[PDB]
PDB file of N, CA and C in Angstrom:
ATOM      1  N   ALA A 585     127.836  31.644  74.569  1.00 51.83           N
ATOM      2  CA  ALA A 585     126.582  32.021  75.196  1.00 51.83           C
ATOM      3  C   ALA A 585     125.443  31.275  74.520  1.00 51.83           C
ATOM      4  N   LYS A 586     124.224  31.555  74.960  1.00 51.14           N
ATOM      5  CA  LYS A 586     123.050  30.921  74.392  1.00 51.14           C
ATOM      6  C   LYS A 586     122.051  31.915  73.838  1.00 51.14           C
ATOM      7  N   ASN A 587     122.399  33.187  73.756  1.00 46.17           N
ATOM      8  CA  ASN A 587     121.479  34.186  73.257  1.00 46.17           C
ATOM      9  C   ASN A 587     122.210  35.112  72.308  1.00 46.17           C
ATOM     10  N   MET A 588     121.450  35.785  71.456  1.00 48.13           N
ATOM     11  CA  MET A 588     122.059  36.710  70.516  1.00 48.13           C
ATOM     12  C   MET A 588     122.425  37.988  71.252  1.00 48.13           C
ATOM     13  N   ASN A 589     123.709  38.307  71.261  1.00 50.40           N
ATOM     14  CA  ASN A 589     124.234  39.434  72.007  1.00 50.40           C
ATOM     15  C   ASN A 589     124.594  40.551  71.048  1.00 50.40           C
ATOM     16  N   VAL A 590     124.398  41.791  71.486  1.00 49.93           N
ATOM     17  CA  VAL A 590     124.680  42.938  70.638  1.00 49.93           C
ATOM     18  C   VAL A 590     126.038  43.551  70.918  1.00 49.93           C
ATOM     19  N   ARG A 591     126.731  43.111  71.959  1.00 47.99           N
ATOM     20  CA  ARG A 591     128.009  43.728  72.295  1.00 47.99           C
ATOM     21  C   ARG A 591     129.058  43.591  71.204  1.00 47.99           C
ATOM     22  N   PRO A 592     129.218  42.453  70.528  1.00 47.08           N
ATOM     23  CA  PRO A 592     130.230  42.391  69.468  1.00 47.08           C
ATOM     24  C   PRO A 592     129.987  43.362  68.341  1.00 47.08           C
ATOM     25  N   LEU A 593     128.735  43.579  67.951  1.00 49.77           N
ATOM     26  CA  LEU A 593     128.474  44.535  66.886  1.00 49.77           C
ATOM     27  C   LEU A 593     128.923  45.927  67.287  1.00 49.77           C
ATOM     28  N   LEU A 594     128.642  46.333  68.520  1.00 47.36           N
ATOM     29  CA  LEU A 594     129.117  47.625  68.979  1.00 47.36           C
ATOM     30  C   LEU A 594     130.624  47.665  69.098  1.00 47.36           C
ATOM     31  N   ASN A 595     131.262  46.534  69.383  1.00 44.00           N
ATOM     32  CA  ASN A 595     132.716  46.520  69.400  1.00 44.00           C
ATOM     33  C   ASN A 595     133.278  46.702  68.004  1.00 44.00           C
ATOM     34  N   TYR A 596     132.559  46.231  66.992  1.00 40.46           N
ATOM     35  CA  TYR A 596     133.040  46.377  65.626  1.00 40.46           C
ATOM     36  C   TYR A 596     133.117  47.838  65.230  1.00 40.46           C
ATOM     37  N   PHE A 597     132.114  48.625  65.602  1.00 41.92           N
ATOM     38  CA  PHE A 597     132.041  50.023  65.208  1.00 41.92           C
ATOM     39  C   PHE A 597     132.594  50.959  66.261  1.00 41.92           C
ATOM     40  N   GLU A 598     133.623  50.548  66.996  1.00 43.38           N
ATOM     41  CA  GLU A 598     134.155  51.429  68.035  1.00 43.38           C
ATOM     42  C   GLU A 598     134.846  52.656  67.467  1.00 43.38           C
ATOM     43  N   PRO A 599     135.789  52.546  66.531  1.00 46.97           N
ATOM     44  CA  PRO A 599     136.433  53.764  66.031  1.00 46.97           C
ATOM     45  C   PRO A 599     135.456  54.725  65.405  1.00 46.97           C
ATOM     46  N   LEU A 600     134.498  54.216  64.644  1.00 45.22           N
ATOM     47  CA  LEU A 600     133.499  55.091  64.061  1.00 45.22           C
ATOM     48  C   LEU A 600     132.656  55.749  65.133  1.00 45.22           C
ATOM     49  N   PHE A 601     132.306  55.020  66.187  1.00 47.13           N
ATOM     50  CA  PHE A 601     131.519  55.635  67.244  1.00 47.13           C
ATOM     51  C   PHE A 601     132.282  56.769  67.894  1.00 47.13           C
ATOM     52  N   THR A 602     133.568  56.562  68.153  1.00 49.99           N
ATOM     53  CA  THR A 602     134.374  57.625  68.737  1.00 49.99           C
ATOM     54  C   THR A 602     134.409  58.845  67.831  1.00 49.99           C
ATOM     55  N   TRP A 603     134.754  58.639  66.565  1.00 50.73           N
ATOM     56  CA  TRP A 603     134.842  59.750  65.633  1.00 50.73           C
ATOM     57  C   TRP A 603     133.516  60.467  65.455  1.00 50.73           C
ATOM     58  N   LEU A 604     132.401  59.750  65.524  1.00 48.88           N
ATOM     59  CA  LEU A 604     131.105  60.400  65.409  1.00 48.88           C
ATOM     60  C   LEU A 604     130.788  61.211  66.647  1.00 48.88           C
ATOM     61  N   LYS A 605     130.983  60.630  67.825  1.00 47.75           N
ATOM     62  CA  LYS A 605     130.751  61.385  69.042  1.00 47.75           C
ATOM     63  C   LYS A 605     131.598  62.637  69.087  1.00 47.75           C
ATOM     64  N   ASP A 606     132.767  62.613  68.465  1.00 46.83           N
ATOM     65  CA  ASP A 606     133.560  63.826  68.358  1.00 46.83           C
ATOM     66  C   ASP A 606     133.023  64.797  67.320  1.00 46.83           C
ATOM     67  N   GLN A 607     132.529  64.305  66.189  1.00 44.45           N
ATOM     68  CA  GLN A 607     132.080  65.183  65.117  1.00 44.45           C
ATOM     69  C   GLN A 607     130.718  65.804  65.363  1.00 44.45           C
ATOM     70  N   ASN A 608     130.084  65.537  66.497  1.00 43.04           N
ATOM     71  CA  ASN A 608     128.759  66.067  66.794  1.00 43.04           C
ATOM     72  C   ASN A 608     128.745  66.867  68.087  1.00 43.04           C
ATOM     73  N   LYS A 609     129.778  67.673  68.312  1.00 44.14           N
ATOM     74  CA  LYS A 609     129.768  68.534  69.484  1.00 44.14           C
ATOM     75  C   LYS A 609     128.755  69.655  69.337  1.00 44.14           C
ATOM     76  N   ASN A 610     128.504  70.099  68.111  1.00 40.68           N
ATOM     77  CA  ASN A 610     127.640  71.239  67.869  1.00 40.68           C
ATOM     78  C   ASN A 610     126.290  70.872  67.277  1.00 40.68           C
ATOM     79  N   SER A 611     126.092  69.629  66.861  1.00 36.23           N
ATOM     80  CA  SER A 611     124.786  69.220  66.385  1.00 36.23           C
ATOM     81  C   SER A 611     123.886  68.890  67.570  1.00 36.23           C
ATOM     82  N   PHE A 612     122.667  68.472  67.271  1.00 33.81           N
ATOM     83  CA  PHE A 612     121.701  68.080  68.288  1.00 33.81           C
ATOM     84  C   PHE A 612     121.397  66.605  68.077  1.00 33.81           C
ATOM     85  N   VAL A 613     122.051  65.749  68.853  1.00 34.12           N
ATOM     86  CA  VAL A 613     121.845  64.314  68.731  1.00 34.12           C
ATOM     87  C   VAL A 613     120.444  63.975  69.211  1.00 34.12           C
ATOM     88  N   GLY A 614     119.599  63.532  68.293  1.00 31.82           N
ATOM     89  CA  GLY A 614     118.223  63.210  68.588  1.00 31.82           C
ATOM     90  C   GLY A 614     117.286  63.873  67.611  1.00 31.82           C
ATOM     91  N   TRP A 615     115.996  63.718  67.878  1.00 35.13           N
ATOM     92  CA  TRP A 615     114.995  64.311  67.010  1.00 35.13           C
ATOM     93  C   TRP A 615     113.706  64.479  67.785  1.00 35.13           C
ATOM     94  N   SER A 616     112.866  65.379  67.298  1.00 33.94           N
ATOM     95  CA  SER A 616     111.560  65.631  67.883  1.00 33.94           C
ATOM     96  C   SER A 616     110.491  65.238  66.885  1.00 33.94           C
ATOM     97  N   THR A 617     109.458  64.557  67.367  1.00 35.78           N
ATOM     98  CA  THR A 617     108.473  63.935  66.497  1.00 35.78           C
ATOM     99  C   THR A 617     107.277  64.828  66.220  1.00 35.78           C
ATOM    100  N   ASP A 618     107.458  66.141  66.203  1.00 35.80           N
ATOM    101  CA  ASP A 618     106.374  67.056  65.880  1.00 35.80           C
ATOM    102  C   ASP A 618     106.583  67.801  64.576  1.00 35.80           C
ATOM    103  N   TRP A 619     107.801  68.258  64.308  1.00 35.11           N
ATOM    104  CA  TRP A 619     108.081  68.956  63.065  1.00 35.11           C
ATOM    105  C   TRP A 619     107.774  68.064  61.878  1.00 35.11           C
ATOM    106  N   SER A 620     107.147  68.639  60.861  1.00 36.34           N
ATOM    107  CA  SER A 620     106.819  67.925  59.642  1.00 36.34           C
ATOM    108  C   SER A 620     107.018  68.854  58.462  1.00 36.34           C
ATOM    109  N   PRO A 621     107.422  68.322  57.308  1.00 37.85           N
ATOM    110  CA  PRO A 621     107.821  69.186  56.197  1.00 37.85           C
ATOM    111  C   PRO A 621     106.682  69.957  55.573  1.00 37.85           C
ATOM    112  N   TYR A 622     105.471  69.851  56.097  1.00 38.75           N
ATOM    113  CA  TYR A 622     104.344  70.606  55.588  1.00 38.75           C
ATOM    114  C   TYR A 622     103.605  71.364  56.673  1.00 38.75           C
ATOM    115  N   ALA A 623     104.148  71.440  57.875  1.00 38.74           N
ATOM    116  CA  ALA A 623     103.457  72.093  58.971  1.00 38.74           C
ATOM    117  C   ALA A 623     103.666  73.589  58.991  1.00 38.74           C
ATOM    118  N   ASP A 624     104.287  74.159  57.966  1.00 38.35           N
ATOM    119  CA  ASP A 624     104.455  75.599  57.901  1.00 38.35           C
ATOM    120  C   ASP A 624     103.416  76.278  57.031  1.00 38.35           C
ATOM    121  N   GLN A 625     102.888  75.588  56.028  1.00 39.16           N
ATOM    122  CA  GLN A 625     101.807  76.113  55.214  1.00 39.16           C
ATOM    123  C   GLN A 625     100.464  75.546  55.618  1.00 39.16           C
ATOM    124  N   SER A 626     100.395  74.845  56.736  1.00 42.21           N
ATOM    125  CA  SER A 626      99.129  74.284  57.149  1.00 42.21           C
ATOM    126  C   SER A 626      98.237  75.371  57.717  1.00 42.21           C
ATOM    127  N   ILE A 627      96.940  75.097  57.721  1.00 42.07           N
ATOM    128  CA  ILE A 627      95.968  75.968  58.360  1.00 42.07           C
ATOM    129  C   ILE A 627      95.147  75.109  59.298  1.00 42.07           C
ATOM    130  N   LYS A 628      94.983  75.565  60.531  1.00 41.61           N
ATOM    131  CA  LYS A 628      94.244  74.812  61.523  1.00 41.61           C
ATOM    132  C   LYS A 628      92.779  75.209  61.511  1.00 41.61           C
ATOM    133  N   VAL A 629      91.919  74.259  61.841  1.00 43.10           N
ATOM    134  CA  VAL A 629      90.479  74.451  61.770  1.00 43.10           C
ATOM    135  C   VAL A 629      89.849  73.806  62.985  1.00 43.10           C
ATOM    136  N   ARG A 630      88.968  74.544  63.658  1.00 45.89           N
ATOM    137  CA  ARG A 630      88.195  74.030  64.781  1.00 45.89           C
ATOM    138  C   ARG A 630      86.717  74.204  64.499  1.00 45.89           C
ATOM    139  N   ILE A 631      85.921  73.218  64.891  1.00 45.46           N
ATOM    140  CA  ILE A 631      84.496  73.195  64.599  1.00 45.46           C
ATOM    141  C   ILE A 631      83.755  72.755  65.848  1.00 45.46           C
ATOM    142  N   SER A 632      82.646  73.425  66.156  1.00 44.67           N
ATOM    143  CA  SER A 632      81.868  73.150  67.361  1.00 44.67           C
ATOM    144  C   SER A 632      80.400  73.022  66.983  1.00 44.67           C
TER     145      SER A 632
END
């Protein structure tokens, strides 16, 4: 080919991908960008 292709890299990690997809039946694949490790002791302030 003439371009950098990502398919071979994914072919390299096929067994690991299978085993991971199996080991995460009960986890939550993904993340939410709102939780932060200090948002529980924070105090909100509004000013007008």
